[PDB]
Design a protein around this ligand. Structure first.
Ligand SMILES: Nc1ncnc2c1ncn2[C@@H]1O[C@H](COP(=O)(O)OP(=O)(O)O)[C@@H](O)[C@H]1O
Ligand SMILES: Nc1ncnc2c1ncn2[C@@H]1O[C@H](COP(=O)(O)OP(=O)(O)O)[C@@H](O)[C@H]1O
Ligand SMILES: [Mg+2]
Ligand SMILES: [Zn+2]
Ligand SMILES: [Zn+2]
Lengths: 267, 377, 281, 623
DNA sequence: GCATGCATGCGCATGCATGCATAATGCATGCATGCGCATGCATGC
């Protein structure tokens, strides 16, 4: 697709606002030492207090709580910019960095029983116990192939959940050359990331007496794979989104709602 | 069902006319032969029999005529045994009024008129559909007796309530109903021309027995109807058009845009043209044995009186050219050319001329074109 | 694809995909309703109905409530699908349901209370009000009244707590009007549970925990003690209790909490109940 | 409602205004010249309504300027929004007619037709501000198509139970029922065209004759649509005035698609036709009706005719700005009157030419061209051709195909448009033999025969020819004879009724008179009415005295023209003498031709050719 | 110079290769849960 965007006032202004938020030169901020600690520890994500952001810039906090995905993208872009600024060498290792959230969310502090469609597409906080966990599985991101017949190597890029909706043109594994010469997959050069799924239930101590419990399903990405175990009391902060069903003609009109974690805390 | 009062009364009165006022029984006796389909009825007999019936038929010709056809069919069926497949038609001759070609207007559509004209062209004869039979391609239902009028018309809708098919049908030609067909062109005569105007041209249509007559170059009177037939490429600009009364709107993804919306509402362009259907064709002004038989006793008396006169050589010279003075030699030559000789053929395959050709050369003003004009007249 | 494209090549068949992030969503719930036992015909199985709840009608009803519902009687519409299963007798039957439109569940008073409580004679009035139909036992009635009012709980900086509720015992001969006082207490208190030893007909005295094998969820069943918080529990037949309940009630009475541990789970439940027990010789 | 959306028109106010005006209006300036057959002292339009009741014509004609004189608001509202104003006028008139004359039988109610909107502007000056407004046109009709039937009410029949319904057209579209009314079947209703109701339509093409002309503007063609009774009220070659609305229509991209073009088309919807003109003579339409109510004018003209010198007076009144050549003007007047149109079909001879063809042969330095221009501008149905500019196919008729519709097989030429009119041919020498071949038949048989592929027809070309010619050397060389100077075939020359040999005598009195007249250069209605009355009210006939005078003139002419060098005589000259005598009889308003007319015709014939001064045995003109 | 020949020129019909427009229904699979069975653990007397 050759379509590109030239100007966008909102996105550029939000990126500038986050750039000013994470400067910490004329202020008593600490995020600079946090970034230096991340570089020292080879980790690739940051946790930022929501109350701190609201104190410094209330409008940005309101927009981020009300709208998650675009603001999170702007955060990640700003992190990439400042990591490049402080030490451009370290930013080469990882594609993109991530943002965690922390602080008192207030009204959005929501129990698994009180999660509703009113909080869709926003960042929510939930307290619960872990009941089901699944095995860690790798997922392909970048694929590399070699052709012994013509001595040529090719690479294909994959982006499935990066974009909201995917199409059959993507997510196709190449196996043959343009002249039907067989290709040999080379697993060393490819790129994979880990994936896990967990389930969280409202704690029996908090649930009303005599009533059945209610649960939420969470997806854990590459960094947060081993941070949870069954039978554990945790607090999860993350986005609440709908799940796109696969292609079909007739739809009943009922989506599946899945919480995508950004921060997992052992209370 | 719903019936028509005027049609029933016209049927009853026309049956009374055919049974009471009998030449028409004698003509129905001839109607047995397979080459005859039409009954010829004199209109003065209708006028004498019932002025009310005559006025009703004149003011309601198109609406009543098919029912008179059924009455005639019942009459011939009662009088004789004829297979039900054959059809029959009615004709009228002696209208007491004439109408000029330009006097034909939209108010006269459907009534009985009589005009005069000159034939210019005749097309070949073809069979045509009258009432068709169709088979539905989805539910295999048979639909019979669909009227074609003046266009190839399919059934409006499949008669099965659940099917509702209006686009896919097959035609079974074996069960269908046919009629002969021929097209002719006529032109307005010179005597009817107004100032600085080109003669008007009209199309005439002949069905079944009347197809034979009206050869090219004739100067004939027609009696029939004036009927409207649709046309295609008349409107380069949008005009009057049809649509459906149902209050139906589109849905997202199937919005009634231009082409799809026009096709969904069944929009058709209302374009039309004027066409004349003829039921009676006559000469404007009317095998030696046949010619002798055609002439009446008084005409034959006149012919015989002319035959045995020597002055026929002289008097014919003066009769055709009364005003031209002298030049009797040219008059005699022109008469001899008019009568002509006898053509013959030889045994070797050659042919010999039987016609005569005449040339006139003269000084100016010697009445040279008067002979040409007199022979043309 | 409804786009005018002349000169351009055209889109294929069935080219549409649903975008999930650009949709408006609302809450959805289904309920199961049973015929009232008060009106079920004799010797006939009860009938059932399915209810649809949208938006703000959700979570307004808890299972076990007696409700009156106003709605629209409808059928499901998911296309003209073919019948399934090995039984195909029924022809042209659409599952029916009810679309719920309305639900009903079956400071001057403060001025009056403040005016009343200021009197010095309120003690006698309250003592008289406590079961006036019962002869004698004025001291017993006053003890029941102060039971109903209850004490005050006090947490401490060390994290230790001290009980703020009152526990009473009544031992006596049969026919001494003990059960009637317990029933009056159960009715009088804003929250009250009346039980015997060994629990009740279909409810235990203490809570229990199980694990659902199909979908792994830790379910807890409400007991007679857990179902009450800040209420009064009247207990007949104190002698018939089983061993497990007898051991648990020690902690329930002392520290007002119950502790249950099973494979992969450890939980502590709150039970802040006043105890009013009766027993025989 | 007080006002109509997009306008300021009130219905009741305009209705009352029109009803009052139909009773109140009186104009003193309109004398008996145009207030014809009406008592002027009485209101005019009420008298018109009374005359309508007398005759029963369902149509009334209203002049706009009278309404403007009564008030300006009504005039402006009628011009701006004809659609909201005219229907009110119809009912306003109908109520008055039915109240004053109850139970008068009519087939339909009264419809009002405005006329004479004051606009003297070039049509190219029209602007979008004037879309859907009332305008006037003065022009000539060249093409009229056949009638088109257009539907107004559709007839539907139920195919299942024979139930029949009628649907009236609304907003130009017909909505056919999708469900029956007695069996409730869907889509069982079929449309039958012949049972429906239709109306007539006609398309006309008109050639503009603007009063104001910019620099370098080509001629214009205007498309008009005429409906109902207005059909067949005009014929090609007629010069008319038209009043109608100005429209705009979109054009389809191609016939098979419904897309329309952005640039709109244009046309004019005719409402009113007028034939009267204050500069040209009366047409044949008004002559065929009894509209000579002006008995005062009739008496005045009949008294004038008895005066002796009126003939010369007419020759004086034919052209005020033209010189002493009285013989030429007398010949042109006799041409205007024309001979009697006898009927000879019973004889079998064919048509007999009853008109007058004249030739003027002279040097270019004369006034024959001005005479042709004046005759062209004076008489309706006039055409002008010049030399090689026209071709043989340009005259008569030519094969065409419509640029708007499929076909228009034949289209008339210059000569046919001149039917019952005058054709002026200039530079007759330069015309090729191909066109002279056509002229040979046109000038005598009054008919044309065309035989081409699929086109065999005979047309009427009853025209009168005024031809101009020059000497071969552009000088009248006296050494050469008349025939050598003219250089035309005798067959073509014999058909001319009069031949005028313009010659320069170089007389001093002529020079003085012409110089004085030309430097000094630095009743028409009575003449028009007299010419129309004489042309439409009298049939000349002659007695035996005129017969013998004509025979004597013929033999004398044959004796004189026998000698070579001069133009010889032929029997057609006798018929020319007859036609001139009949025209002179018409001039005197006499049904009987006297010997005076024959003698005058002989005198004109002798003087036109200058045979008196010409030397009979050498063919050389002398002075 | 006038009479004739004629190479150029224009508009509307059909024939033929490419190109354009259309367009839901039936069958299969995995998740939830009842019903019969044998082992085994825990609880009395
Ligand atoms: N012999 C004659 N008898 C009667 N009329 C004649 C005679 N000769 C000539 N005419 C008149 O003279 C005219 C001759 O013109 P026309 O015959 O057309 O000449 P051409 O045919 O040579 O061109 C006719 O109108 C005719 O009436
Ligand atoms: N003092 C009293 N006043 C009123 N009713 C009494 C009194 N003593 C006993 N009764 C009646 O006797 C019955 C006592 O039965 P119950 O209270 O169940 O005995 P227990 O509590 O010992 O099992 C009650 O129904 C009560 O109506
Ligand atoms: Mg001739
Ligand atoms: Zn069907
Ligand atoms: Zn019906």
């Amino acid at each position: 697709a050759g379509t590109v965007v030239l100007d966008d006032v909102e996105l550029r202004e939000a990126q500038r606002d986050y750039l000013d938020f994470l400067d910490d030169e004329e202020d008593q901020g600490i995020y600079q030492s946090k970034v230096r600690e991340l570089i020292s520890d080879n980790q690739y994500r940051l946790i930022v207090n929501v109350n701190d952001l609201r104190r410094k810039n209330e409008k940005r906090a309101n927009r981020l709580l009300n709208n998650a995905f675009e603001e999170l993208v702007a955060f990640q872009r700003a992190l990439k910019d400042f990591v490049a600024s402080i030490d451009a060498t370290y930013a080469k290792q990882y594609e993109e960095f991530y943002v965690g959230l922390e602080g008192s969310f207030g009204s959005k502090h929501v129990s698994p029983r009180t999660l509703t469609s009113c909080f869709l597409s926003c960042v929510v906080c939930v307290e619960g116990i872990v009941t089901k966990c699944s095995l860690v599985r790798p997922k392909v991101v970048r694929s590399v192939h070699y052709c012994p017949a013509t001595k040529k190597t090719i690479e294909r890029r994959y982006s499935d959940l990066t974009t909201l909706v995917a199409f059959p043109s993507s997510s196709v594994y190449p196996t043959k050359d343009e002249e039907n010469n067989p290709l040999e997959t080379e697993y060393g050069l490819s790129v994979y990331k880990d994936h896990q799924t967990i389930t969280i239930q409202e704690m029996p101590e908090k649930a009303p007496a005599g009533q059945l419990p209610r649960s939420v399903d969470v997806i854990l990405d590459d960094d947060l794979v081993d941070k949870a175990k069954p039978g554990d009391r945790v607090q999860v902060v993350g986005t609440y989104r709908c799940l796109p069903g696969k292609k079909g003609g007739y739809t009943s009109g009922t989506f599946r709602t899945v919480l995508i974690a950004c921060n997992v805390k052992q209370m | 069902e719903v019936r028509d009062e005027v049609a029933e009364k016209c049927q009853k009165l026309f049956l009374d006319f055919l049974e009471e006022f009998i030449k028409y029984l004698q003509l129905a006796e001839e109607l047995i032969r397979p080459e005859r389909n039409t009954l010829v009825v004199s209109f003065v007999d209708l006028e004498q029999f019932n002025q009310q019936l005559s006025t009703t038929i004149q003011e309601e010709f198109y609406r009543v005529y098919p029912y008179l056809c059924r009455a005639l069919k019942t009459f011939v069926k009662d009088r004789k045994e004829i297979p039900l497949a054959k059809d029959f038609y009615v004709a009228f001759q002696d209208l007491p009024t004439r109408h000029k070609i330009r006097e034909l207007t939209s108010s006269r559509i459907g009534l009985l008129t009589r005009i005069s004209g000159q034939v210019v062209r005749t097309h070949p004869v073809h069979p045509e559909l009258v009432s068709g039979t169709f088979l539905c391609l989805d539910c295999q239902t048979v639909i019979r007796d669909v009227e074609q009028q003046f266009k190839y018309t399919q059934p409006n809708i499949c008669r099965n309530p659940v099917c509702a098919n209006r686009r896919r049908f097959l035609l079974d030609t074996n069960k269908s109903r046919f009629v002969d067909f021929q097209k002719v062109r006529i032109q307005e005569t010179q005597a009817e021309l107004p100032r600085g105007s080109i003669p008007r041209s009209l199309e005439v249509i002949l069905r079944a027995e009347a197809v034979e007559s009206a050869q090219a170059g004739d100067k004939c009177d027609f009696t029939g109807t004036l009927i409207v037939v649709p046309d295609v490429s008349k409107l380069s600009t949008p005009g009057a058009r049809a649509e459906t009364n149902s209050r139906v709107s589109g849905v997202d993804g199937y919005e009634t845009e231009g082409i799809r919306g026009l096709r969904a509402l069944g929009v058709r362009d209302l374009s039309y043209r004027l066409v004349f259907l003829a039921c009676c064709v006559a000469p404007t002004n009317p095998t030696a044995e046949s010619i002798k038989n055609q002439m009446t006793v008084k005409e034959w008396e006149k012919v015989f009186e002319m035959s045995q006169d020597k002055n026929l050589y002289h008097n014919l010279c003066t009769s055709l050219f009364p005003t031209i003075h002298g030049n009797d030699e040219v008059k005699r030559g022109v008469l001899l050319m008019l009568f002509g000789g006898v053509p013959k053929t030889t045994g070797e395959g050659t042919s010999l001329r039987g016609d005569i050709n005449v040339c006139i050369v003269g000084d100016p003003s010697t009445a040279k074109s008067q002979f040409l004009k007199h022979v043309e007249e | 694809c409804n786009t005018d494209q002349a000169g351009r090549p055209k889109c294929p068949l069935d080219p549409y995909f649903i975008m999930p992030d650009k949709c408006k969503c609302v809450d959805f719930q289904t309920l199961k309703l049973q015929e009232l036992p008060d009106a079920v015909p004799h010797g006939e199985m009860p009938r059932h109905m399915q209810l649809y709840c949208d938006r703000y009608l959700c979570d307004k009803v808890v299972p076990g409530n007696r409700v009156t519902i106003m709605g629209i009687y409808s059928i499901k519409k998911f296309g003209l699908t073919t019948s399934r299963g090995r039984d195909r007798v029924g022809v042209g039957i659409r599952s029916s349901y009810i679309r719920v439109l309305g639900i009903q569940v079956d400071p001057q008073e403060e001025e009056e209370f403040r005016r009343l409580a200021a009197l010095p004679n309120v003690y006698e009035v309250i003592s008289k009000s406590i079961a006036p139909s019962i002869f004698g036992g004025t001291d017993m009635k006053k003890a029941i009244a102060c039971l109903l009012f209850g004490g005050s709980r006090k947490r401490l900086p060390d994290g230790l707590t001290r009980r703020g509720d009152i526990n009473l015992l009544m031992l006596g001969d049969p026919g001494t009007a003990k059960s009637q006082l317990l029933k009056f207490v159960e009715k009088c208190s804003p929250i009250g549970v009346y039980t015997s030893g060994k629990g009740s007909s279909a409810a235990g005295l203490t809570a229990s925990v199980m694990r659902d094998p199909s979908s792994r969820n830790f379910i807890m069943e409400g007991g007679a003690m857990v179902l009450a918080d800040g209420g009064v529990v009247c207990i007949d037949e104190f002698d018939k209790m089983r061993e497990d309940d007898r051991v648990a009630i020690h902690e329930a009475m002392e520290q007002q909490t119950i502790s249950i541990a099973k494979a992969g789970i450890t939980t502590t439940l709150n039970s802040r109940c006043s105890v009013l027990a009766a027993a025989n010789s | 409602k007080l006002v109509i959306w997009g306008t300021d028109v009130n219905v009741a106010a305009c209705k009352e205004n029109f009803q009052r005006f139909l009773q109140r209006f009186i104009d003193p300036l309109a004398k008996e010249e145009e207030n014809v057959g009406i008592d002027i002292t009485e209101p005019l339009y009420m008298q018109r309504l009374g005359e309508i009741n007398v005759i029963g014509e369902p149509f009334l004609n209203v002049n706009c300027e009278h309404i403007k004189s009564f008030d300006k608001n009504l005039y402006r509202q009628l011009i701006s929004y004809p659609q909201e104003v005219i229907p009110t006028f119809d009912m306003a008139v109908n109520e008055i007619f039915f109240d004053r004359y109850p139970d008068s039988i009519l087939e339909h109610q009264i419809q009002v037709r405005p006329f004479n909107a004051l606009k003297t502007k070039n049509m190219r000056n029209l602007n979008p501000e004037d879309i859907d407004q009332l305008i006037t046109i003065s022009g000539m009709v060249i093409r009229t198509s056949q009638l088109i039937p257009e539907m107004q009410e559709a007839f539907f029949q139920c195919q299942v139970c024979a139930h029949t319904t009628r649907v009236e057209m609304d907003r130009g579209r017909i909505a056919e029922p999708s469900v029956c009314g007695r069996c409730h079947t869907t889509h069982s209703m079929a449309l039958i065209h012949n049972r429906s109701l239709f109306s007539d339509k006609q398309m006309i093409k008109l050639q503009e004759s603007p009063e104001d002309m910019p620099a370098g503007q080509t001629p214009h063609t205007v498309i008009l649509f005429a409906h109902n009774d207005l059909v067949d009220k005009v014929q090609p070659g007629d010069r008319v005035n038209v009043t109608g609305i100005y429209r705009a229509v979109p054009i389809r991209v191609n016939p098979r698609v419904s897309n329309v073009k952005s640039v709109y088309k244009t046309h004019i919807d005719v409402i009113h036709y007028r034939k009267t003109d204050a500069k040209r003579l009366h047409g044949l339409d008004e002559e065929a009706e009894q509209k000579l109510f002006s008995e005062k004018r009739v008496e005045l003209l009949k008294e004038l005719s008895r005066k002796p010198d009126i003939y010369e007076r007419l020759a004086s009144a034919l052209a005020p700005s033209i010189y002493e050549h009285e013989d030429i003007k007398k010949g042109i007047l006799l041409q205007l009157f024309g001979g009697t149109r006898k009927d000879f079909s019973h004889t079998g001879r064919g048509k007999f030419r009853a008109e007058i063809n004249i030739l003027l042969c002279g040097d270019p330095g004369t006034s024959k061209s001005q005479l042709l221009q004046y005759v062209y501008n004076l008489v309706p149905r006039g055409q002008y051709t010049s030399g090689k500019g026209s071709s043989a196919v340009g005259l008569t008729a030519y094969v065409m195909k419509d640029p708007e519709t499929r076909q228009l097989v034949l289209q008339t030429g210059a000569l046919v448009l001149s039917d019952n009119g005058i054709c002026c041919i200039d530079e007759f020498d330069k015309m090729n033999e191909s066109t002279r071949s056509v002229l040979h038949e046109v000038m005598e048989q009054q008919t044309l025969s065309i035989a081409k592929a699929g086109i065999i027809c005979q047309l009427n070309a009853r025209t009168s020819v005024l031809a101009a010619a020059n000497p071969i050397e552009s000088q009248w060389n006296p050494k050469k004879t008349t025939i050598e100077n003219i250089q035309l075939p005798h067959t073509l020359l014999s058909r001319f009724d009069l031949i005028f040999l313009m010659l320069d005598p170089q007389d001093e009195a002529y020079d003085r008179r012409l110089a004085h007249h030309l430097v000094a250069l630095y009743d028409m209605a009575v003449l028009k009415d007299y010419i129309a009355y004489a042309h439409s009210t009298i049939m000349p006939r002659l007695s035996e005295e005129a017969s013998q005078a004509l025979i004597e003139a013929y033999v004398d002419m044959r004796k004189i023209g026998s000698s070579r060098g001069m133009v010889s005589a032929y029997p057609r000259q006798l018929e020319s003498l007859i036609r001139l005598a009949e025209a002179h009889a018409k001039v005197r308003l006499s049904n009987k031709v006297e010997a005076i007319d024959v003698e005058e015709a002989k005198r004109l014939h002798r003087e036109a050719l200058k045979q008196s001064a010409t030397d009979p045995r050498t063919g050389i003109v002398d002075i």
